[PDB]
A paper describes a structure:
[name] feathery mottle virus (SPFMV) and [name] (SPMMV) are members of the genera Potyvirus and Ipomovirus, family Potyviridae, sharing Ipomoea batatas as common host, but transmitted, respectively, by aphids and whiteflies. A common feature for all potyvirids is the structure of virions as non-enveloped, flexible rod-shaped particles, composed of multiple copies of a unique coat protein (CP) helically arranged around the RNA genome. Here we report the generation of virus-like particles (VLPs) by transient expression of the CPs of SPFMV and SPMMV in the presence of a replicating RNA in Nicotiana benthamiana. Analysis of the purified VLPs by cryo-electron microscopy, gave structures with resolutions of 2.6 and 3.0 Å, respectively, showing a similar left-handed helical arrangement of 8.8 CP subunits per turn with the C-terminus at the inner surface and a binding pocket for the encapsidated ssRNA.
The structures of SPFMV and SPMMV were determined using single particle [name] with helical symmetry, at resolutions of 2.6 Å (SPFMV) and 3.0 Å (SPMMV). Each subunit is separated by helical rises of 3.97 Å and 3.98 Å and helical twists of 41.2° and 40.83°, respectively, for SPFMV and SPMMV. For instance, α-helix 1, which slots in the crevice of the adjacent subunit is tilted downwards in SPMMV, compared with SPFMV and PVY N-terminal regions, with a root-mean square deviation (RMSD) of 4.7 Å. On the other hand, the predicted structure for SPMMV CP showed a flanking loop followed by helix-turn helix motif at the N-terminus, not observed in the [name] structure. The transition temperatures were calculated after data normalization using the first derivative of a native fraction for each sample, and the results showed that SPFMV-VLPs dissociated at 55 °C (Tm1), while the CP units unfolded at 66 °C (Tm2), whilst SPMMV-VLPs dissociated at 60 °C (Tm1), with unfolding of CP units at 69 °C (Tm2).
Numbering used by the authors: 65 to 295
The structure:
RNA sequence: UUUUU
């Protein structure tokens, strides 16, 4: 059997609906084989490109800083801060998030930035807009680990995970789109079980009272009953 | 989907 044919017939076992049999050709197979987009650009768990750039442009206008200096200077600081403290929406009560200027592995001064103009501008929640930087956050935490002064991950410490070697997987903005092995899947997921620590209520206590009974009277008569004379 | 202050 020097030659063993070529097959490559495709389809066969794969059931094809009758409406698609006229377009489900062999040449159609090769056309869709090229459509393999990144598995981190299609899911709804992250902000889309249209609303990611909206977040980038809106927050730099509020800070009155250029996009070039935003993507270079304060974005890594924001990623580090989101590594230290969580990325929850109700972090706005801090009213300020801190960035520290570093001279040579030694703090010199802490800078203060408003936290509202960076959370509300993330249209599909800030937990989703920061998921694009989840892969960069792990690398930056590893860099901090190599420097001898590891970061303190809020999720890992809160969940009870004291392992500093892999204290990530406690990052609040990991979508798990990365090829996590089965031994890190449960470590990340048990940390994710910090959600059941606190409840959530969907609706507040309404607006003010619509009405509490009204009054309408005039003239000179009894206190409340207008000329009460019936029997 | 949200939910990890």
């Amino acid at each position: 059997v020097t030659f063993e044919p070529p097959r490559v017939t495709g389809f066969g076992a794969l059931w094809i609906p009758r409406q698609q049999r006229n377009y489900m050709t062999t040449a159609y197979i090769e056309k869709i084989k090229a459509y393999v987009p990144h598995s981190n650009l299609i899911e709804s768990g992250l902000a889309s490109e249209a609303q990611l750039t909206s977040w980038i442009e809106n927050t730099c206008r509020d800070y009155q800083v250029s996009m070039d200096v935003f993507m270079t200077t304060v974005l890594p600081a924001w990623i580090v801060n989101c590594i230290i403290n969580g990325t929850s929406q109700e972090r706005t009560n801090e009213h300020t998030w801190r960035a520290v200027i570093m001279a040579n592995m030694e703090d010199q001064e802490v800078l203060y930035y408003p936290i509202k103009p960076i959370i509300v501008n993330a249209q599909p929640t800030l937990r989703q807009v920061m998921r694009h930087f989840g892969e960069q956050a792990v690398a930056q935490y590893m860099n901090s680990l190599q420097a001898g002064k590891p970061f303190t991950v809020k999720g890992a410490v809160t969940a009870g995970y004291a392992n500093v070697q892999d204290a990530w997987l406690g990052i609040d903005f990991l979508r798990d789109t990365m090829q996590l092995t089965t031994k890190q899947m449960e470590v990340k997921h048990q940390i994710i079980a910090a959600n059941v620590t606190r409840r959530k209520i969907r609706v507040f206590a309404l607006a003010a009272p619509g009405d509490g009974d009204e009054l309408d009277t005039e003239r000179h008569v009894v206190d409340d009953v207008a000329r009460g004379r019936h029997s």
